[PDB]
Write a protein that holds these residues in place. Structure first.
Motif, PDB file in Angstrom:
ATOM      1  N   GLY A  18       0.810  -1.205   0.000  1.00 59.18           N
ATOM      2  CA  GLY A  18       0.000   0.000   0.000  1.00 59.18           C
ATOM      3  C   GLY A  18       0.846   1.257   0.000  1.00 59.18           C
ATOM      4  N   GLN A  19       0.286   2.343  -0.527  1.00 56.96           N
ATOM      5  CA  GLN A  19       1.011   3.603  -0.641  1.00 56.96           C
ATOM      6  C   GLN A  19       1.324   4.199   0.724  1.00 56.96           C
ATOM      7  N   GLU A  20       0.312   4.260   1.584  1.00 54.89           N
ATOM      8  CA  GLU A  20       0.463   4.859   2.903  1.00 54.89           C
ATOM      9  C   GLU A  20       1.670   4.263   3.619  1.00 54.89           C
ATOM     10  N   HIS A  21       1.811   2.946   3.525  1.00 57.89           N
ATOM     11  CA  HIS A  21       2.906   2.247   4.185  1.00 57.89           C
ATOM     12  C   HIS A  21       4.248   2.626   3.566  1.00 57.89           C
ATOM     13  N   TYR A  22       4.335   2.528   2.243  1.00 61.00           N
ATOM     14  CA  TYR A  22       5.572   2.823   1.524  1.00 61.00           C
ATOM     15  C   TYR A  22       5.988   4.289   1.646  1.00 61.00           C
ATOM     16  N   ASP A  23       5.004   5.179   1.743  1.00 61.23           N
ATOM     17  CA  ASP A  23       5.276   6.609   1.864  1.00 61.23           C
ATOM     18  C   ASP A  23       5.829   6.980   3.240  1.00 61.23           C
ATOM     19  N   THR A  24       5.093   6.645   4.297  1.00 59.08           N
ATOM     20  CA  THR A  24       5.549   6.946   5.653  1.00 59.08           C
ATOM     21  C   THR A  24       6.839   6.195   5.972  1.00 59.08           C
ATOM     22  N   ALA A  25       7.022   5.043   5.335  1.00 61.56           N
ATOM     23  CA  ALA A  25       8.246   4.275   5.498  1.00 61.56           C
ATOM     24  C   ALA A  25       9.438   5.060   4.959  1.00 61.56           C
ATOM     25  N   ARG A  26       9.345   5.472   3.698  1.00 61.25           N
ATOM     26  CA  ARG A  26      10.399   6.253   3.060  1.00 61.25           C
ATOM     27  C   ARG A  26      10.587   7.599   3.752  1.00 61.25           C
ATOM     28  N   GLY A  27       9.497   8.145   4.279  1.00 58.21           N
ATOM     29  CA  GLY A  27       9.536   9.422   4.969  1.00 58.21           C
ATOM     30  C   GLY A  27      10.368   9.380   6.235  1.00 58.21           C
ATOM     31  N   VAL A  28      10.150   8.348   7.044  1.00 61.65           N
ATOM     32  CA  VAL A  28      10.954   8.133   8.241  1.00 61.65           C
ATOM     33  C   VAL A  28      12.405   7.982   7.837  1.00 61.65           C
ATOM     34  N   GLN A  29      12.623   7.251   6.748  1.00 61.21           N
ATOM     35  CA  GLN A  29      13.955   7.062   6.208  1.00 61.21           C
ATOM     36  C   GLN A  29      14.538   8.410   5.814  1.00 61.21           C
ATOM     37  N   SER A  30      13.755   9.181   5.070  1.00 59.45           N
ATOM     38  CA  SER A  30      14.186  10.483   4.578  1.00 59.45           C
ATOM     39  C   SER A  30      14.589  11.418   5.709  1.00 59.45           C
ATOM     40  N   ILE A  31      13.705  11.568   6.687  1.00 57.10           N
ATOM     41  CA  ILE A  31      13.951  12.485   7.792  1.00 57.10           C
ATOM     42  C   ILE A  31      15.118  12.036   8.666  1.00 57.10           C
ATOM     43  N   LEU A  32      15.215  10.738   8.928  1.00 55.97           N
ATOM     44  CA  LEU A  32      16.338  10.226   9.700  1.00 55.97           C
ATOM     45  C   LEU A  32      17.645  10.587   9.001  1.00 55.97           C
ATOM     46  N   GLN A  33      17.619  10.555   7.672  1.00 55.30           N
ATOM     47  CA  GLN A  33      18.785  10.889   6.863  1.00 55.30           C
ATOM     48  C   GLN A  33      19.166  12.360   6.973  1.00 55.30           C
ATOM     49  N   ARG A  34      18.190  13.239   6.767  1.00 52.74           N
ATOM     50  CA  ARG A  34      18.445  14.675   6.789  1.00 52.74           C
ATOM     51  C   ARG A  34      19.056  15.105   8.117  1.00 52.74           C
ATOM     52  N   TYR A  35      18.570  14.515   9.203  1.00 51.62           N
ATOM     53  CA  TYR A  35      19.119  14.784  10.527  1.00 51.62           C
ATOM     54  C   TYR A  35      20.606  14.445  10.552  1.00 51.62           C
ATOM     55  N   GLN A  36      20.968  13.345   9.900  1.00 53.87           N
ATOM     56  CA  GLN A  36      22.359  12.920   9.838  1.00 53.87           C
ATOM     57  C   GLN A  36      23.224  14.004   9.198  1.00 53.87           C
ATOM     58  N   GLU A  37      22.723  14.609   8.127  1.00 52.94           N
ATOM     59  CA  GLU A  37      23.441  15.683   7.450  1.00 52.94           C
ATOM     60  C   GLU A  37      23.511  16.932   8.320  1.00 52.94           C
ATOM     61  N   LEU A  38      22.387  17.276   8.940  1.00 48.59           N
ATOM     62  CA  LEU A  38      22.322  18.430   9.828  1.00 48.59           C
ATOM     63  C   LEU A  38      23.255  18.256  11.017  1.00 48.59           C
ATOM     64  N   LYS A  39      23.422  17.012  11.453  1.00 46.16           N
ATOM     65  CA  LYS A  39      24.219  16.708  12.637  1.00 46.16           C
ATOM     66  C   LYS A  39      25.639  17.252  12.537  1.00 46.16           C
ATOM     67  N   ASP A  40      26.161  17.319  11.319  1.00 43.00           N
ATOM     68  CA  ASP A  40      27.517  17.806  11.112  1.00 43.00           C
ATOM     69  C   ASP A  40      27.656  19.291  11.437  1.00 43.00           C
ATOM     70  N   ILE A  41      26.775  20.114  10.883  1.00 43.00           N
ATOM     71  CA  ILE A  41      26.863  21.553  11.111  1.00 43.00           C
ATOM     72  C   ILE A  41      26.491  21.919  12.552  1.00 43.00           C
ATOM     73  N   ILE A  42      25.699  21.069  13.199  1.00 41.88           N
ATOM     74  CA  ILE A  42      25.251  21.333  14.564  1.00 41.88           C
ATOM     75  C   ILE A  42      26.387  21.257  15.582  1.00 41.88           C
ATOM     76  N   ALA A  43      27.370  20.407  15.315  1.00 39.59           N
ATOM     77  CA  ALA A  43      28.536  20.329  16.183  1.00 39.59           C
ATOM     78  C   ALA A  43      29.493  21.477  15.897  1.00 39.59           C
ATOM     79  N   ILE A  44      29.806  21.674  14.621  1.00 41.65           N
ATOM     80  CA  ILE A  44      30.800  22.665  14.227  1.00 41.65           C
ATOM     81  C   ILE A  44      30.373  24.100  14.548  1.00 41.65           C
ATOM     82  N   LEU A  45      29.193  24.507  14.088  1.00 38.56           N
ATOM     83  CA  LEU A  45      28.719  25.863  14.367  1.00 38.56           C
ATOM     84  C   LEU A  45      27.380  25.927  15.099  1.00 38.56           C
TER      85      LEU A  45
END
Lengths: 229, 69
Positions: free
Chosen positions: A120-147
């Motif tokens: 189902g779409q709802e499942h695949y969407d929220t699934a990828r979304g959690v994946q997406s957001i968890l990822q973006r945080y990883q990228e943000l995590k770098d600048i959060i330490a430095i500056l």
């Protein structure tokens, strides 16, 4: 399965299966191969894995613990295993250290079945979304330490707060875990879960502190704990 | 400043004044009395210097090769 029922099968260690099979071949006099494994490692794993399926009459589903020696996926043991898995749930020693005890990495855990027209779409969407957001945080995590945190845009430090929350949300007290923690375990549906993660990132529950999502069933419980806070 | 055949306006980049100045001066004095972090704008240097720090770290590289130093 012959009786026509959908049974599960938990093999405790696919590693100790192949490894035990190595000793046999050894003292039996066979010539070693890859890393000293039996010259039949492929076929041994082949038959064990192949009878485990869904027949016309019934079905036998399996979840098996694949230990990785030296955390090396090139070792023949977990290597020949991969070809047969329909889904792979990678756990993490470091995730566990930080306190999350359904200690799985959402970013590396996969499923040959996690596509939209299957689940189902709802499942695949929220699934990828959690994946997406968890990822973006990883990228943000770098600048959060430095500056520091003050540098993130309002939208960013909103993504990080919202991500931080879903991280704890996907941890939960197992029932077989009570001998350890003492807290009561909780079973959650597939529809409660999706209903939870989708909302927590859209995201309604921004007004409650992270800890509300720490160890709970559906957010329905999280909002409760949030009142005690 | 008007002069024979030329007039220039030497503009301030922000409202100046003895009141506003002493405010900026007191701030500068304070920030020095207390070593405290502050973000420079550069993000290109931020996440790059971070990746560089993680990638460089914990490599036994100088030991693996035989190097003099």
């Amino acid at each position: 399965r012959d009786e026509g029922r959908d049974v599960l099968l938990f093999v405790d260690n696919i590693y100790r299966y192949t490894l035990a099979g190595t000793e046999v071949s050894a003292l039996l006099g066979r010539m070693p191969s890859a890393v000293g494994y039996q010259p039949t490692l492929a076929e041994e794993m082949g038959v064990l894995q192949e009878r485990i399926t869904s027949t016309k009459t019934g079905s036998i589903t399996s979840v098996q613990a694949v230990y990785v020696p030296a955390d090396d996926l090139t070792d023949p043991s977990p290597a020949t295993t991969f070809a047969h898995l329909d889904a792979t749930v990678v756990l993490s020693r470091q995730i566990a250290s930080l306190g999350i005890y359904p200690a799985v990495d959402p970013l590396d855990s996969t499923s040959r079945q996690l596509d939209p027209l299957v689940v189902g779409q709802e499942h695949y969407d929220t699934a990828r979304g959690v994946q997406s957001i968890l990822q973006r945080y990883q990228e943000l995590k770098d600048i959060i330490a430095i500056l520091g945190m003050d540098e993130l845009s309002e939208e960013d430090k909103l993504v990080v707060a919202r991500a931080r929350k879903i991280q704890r949300f996907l941890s939960q007290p197992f029932f077989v875990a009570e001998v350890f923690t003492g807290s009561p375990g909780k079973y959650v549906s597939l529809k409660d879960t999706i209903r939870g993660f989708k909302g927590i990132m859209e995201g309604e529950y921004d007004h409650l502190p992270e800890q509300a999502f720490y160890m709970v069933g559906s957010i329905e419980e999280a909002v409760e704990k949030a009142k005690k806070l | 400043e008007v002069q024979p055949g030329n007039v220039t306006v030497l503009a301030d980049t922000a409202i100046r004044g003895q009141d506003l100045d002493e405010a900026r001066a007191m701030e500068a004095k304070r920030k020095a009395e207390e070593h405290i972090s502050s973000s420079h704008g550069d993000v290109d240097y931020a996440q790059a210097s971070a990746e560089l720090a993680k990638a460089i770290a914990q490599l036994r590289v100088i030991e693996l090769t035989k190097k003099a130093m």
